[PDB]
Design a protein around this ligand. Sequence first.
Ligand SMILES: [Zn+2]
Length: 250
Amino acid sequence: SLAKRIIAALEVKDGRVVKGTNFENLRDSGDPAELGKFYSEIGIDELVFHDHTASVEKRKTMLELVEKVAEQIDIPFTVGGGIHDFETASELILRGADKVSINTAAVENPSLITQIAQTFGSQAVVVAIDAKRVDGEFMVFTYSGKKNTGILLRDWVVEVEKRGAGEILLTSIDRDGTKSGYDTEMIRFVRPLTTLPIIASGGAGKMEHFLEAFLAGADAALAASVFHFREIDVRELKEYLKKHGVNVRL
Ligand SMILES: [Zn+2]
């Protein structure tokens, strides 16, 4: 069966992890680079950083983050949060990120996907798609879930692959922040529409949710607070998944 990845998401601001972690062993539980290194050592496959720094310092702050993280880890990492053009994405990849996440800017200018891919390869471009049910249809939302674009998820997935994206980070707004489970109906809906790797995001609460997401056709599963606050142990999770037939890296 197909190889599956466990991904930790770190929300960051001003070079700090927002709300930190429960990991007492670390010198500084809010240092993104230290936390990243720790996650790679306990068995996380990749990292996603999402930045919320204020506009005047944002560009420099995200570049510093990327350089510091790149020195501490050899596993892939993605950076995102307000990447609106090619030059911003380029500077971040050159400074050390393996991949960039784009969402609002991709919907507003789908050629941005192609532009980044032309220089850095499709594998450098993660399109984050936030979606929610509206009147029985899956719709795409932008601006941190504030705007219903009126674009069907079905149509956007196909366009994203056509434009040259390498991966889709699929967040169910219906589940994000809850610990109720991944939106497996949404994952199953997207799976036949694309050949791209799908990162399931939103709703992780317990180890069984990961199994469910992988059965639904996710290639990777992303989570944040379940790991940060140690509700789920990463090694225990991989051992659980392997036991039940999922091809994870031990
Ligand atoms: Zn964020």
